[PDB]
C-alpha cells in the first residue's frame, strides 16, 4: 500500500495545497458595532461552525490524508481543529496590525475582546503571532505547508509511519520554497526552525482557548459540540 502523496514533487505539493484552500467566510451582517459578551460569542461560534464544514473538505484534499483510516482522520481533526482555525485567523490578520480579521466584515481589536472574560489574553497571543508572521514576511505557500503540518502533527503521537513520511515531504517542500526565494542554507534552516517553533505557541493558544470553550458550554451546534467534547473528555 503506497501513497500518491510521496510521489508528488514540491511544486505539485504546493499547488495541490493552494488549490485546496478553504474560502474566506463572512459573519452575520448585523454585528451591532458595540458588542456584548453574548453577541460576541454568537458571531464567533456561528462563524467557526461554518468554517468547520470547509475545514473537513480541505483536510480530505491535503495530500496523504485520505490514505489514513477513518478513525485516524477523525482523531487528527478532533485534536487539530482550533489550531487550524487560529492559524487561519492569524494569517488573515497579517495585513491588519493590531486587529483580528475574523471575517472581511468582522475586524476586532484588543478591547473588543474584553467583552468576553479571558478572551483578552488569547486575543493578545493571536496578535503577537500575527505580528510575528508579519515581521517574518510569511508567504502563502509557507502558510499552507504550516497548516497541513498542524493537521498531521497534532494528533500523531496521541495514536504512524505513514504520517511521518508525509511530514518529511512537507518539510522538503518548505525548504524547497525557501531555496527558491534565495535564502542561503543557514537562512533556510534557521527560518524552518522559527516557523516550526511558532507552532508550539499555536498549540498553546489552542489549549488555553479550548479550556475556556468547554467551560463556557459547561457554564454551538452538534458538530461543534462533538468537536469540543473530544477535548473535554480529558479535562
Amino acid at each position: 500500500k503506497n501513497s500518491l502523496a510521496l510521489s508528488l514533487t514540491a511544486d505539485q505539493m504546493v499547488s495541490a495545497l493552494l488549490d485546496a484552500e478553504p474560502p474566506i467566510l463572512y459573519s452575520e451582517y448585523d454585528p451591532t458595532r458595540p458588542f456584548s459578551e453574548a453577541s460576541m460569542m454568537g458571531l464567533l461560534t456561528n462563524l467557526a461552525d461554518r468554517e468547520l464544514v470547509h475545514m473537513i473538505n480541505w483536510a480530505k484534499r491535503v495530500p496523504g490524508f485520505v490514505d489514513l483510516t477513518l478513525h485516524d482522520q477523525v482523531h487528527l481533526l478532533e485534536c487539530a481543529w482550533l489550531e487550524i482555525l487560529m492559524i487561519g485567523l492569524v494569517w488573515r490578520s497579517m495585513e491588519h496590525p493590531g486587529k483580528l480579521l475574523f471575517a472581511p466584515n468582522l475586524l476586532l481589536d484588543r478591547n473588543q475582546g474584553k467583552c468576553v472574560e479571558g478572551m483578552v489574553e488569547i486575543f493578545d497571543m493571536l496578535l503577537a503571532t500575527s505580528s510575528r508572521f508579519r515581521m517574518m514576511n510569511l508567504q502563502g505557500e509557507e502558510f499552507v505547508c504550516l497548516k497541513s503540518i498542524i493537521l498531521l502533527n497534532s494528533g500523531v503521537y496521541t495514536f504512524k509511519d505513514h504520517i511521518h513520511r508525509v511530514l518529511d515531504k512537507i518539510t522538503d517542500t518548505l525548504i524547497h520554497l525557501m531555496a527558491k526565494a534565495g535564502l542561503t542554507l543557514q537562512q533556510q534552516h534557521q527560518r524552518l526552525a522559527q516557523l516550526l517553533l511558532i507552532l508550539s505557541h499555536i498549540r498553546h493558544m489552542s489549549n488555553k482557548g479550548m479550556e475556556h470553550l468547554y467551560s463556557m458550554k459547561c457554564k454551538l451546534s452538534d458538530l461543534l459540540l462533538e468537536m469540543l467534547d473530544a477535548h473535554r473528555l480529558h479535562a
Partner: peptide, 9 residues
Amino acid sequence: KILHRLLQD
C-alpha cells in the same frame, strides 16, 4: 458521530 458522516460525503 457527525464527523464520521462528513468525512465520507
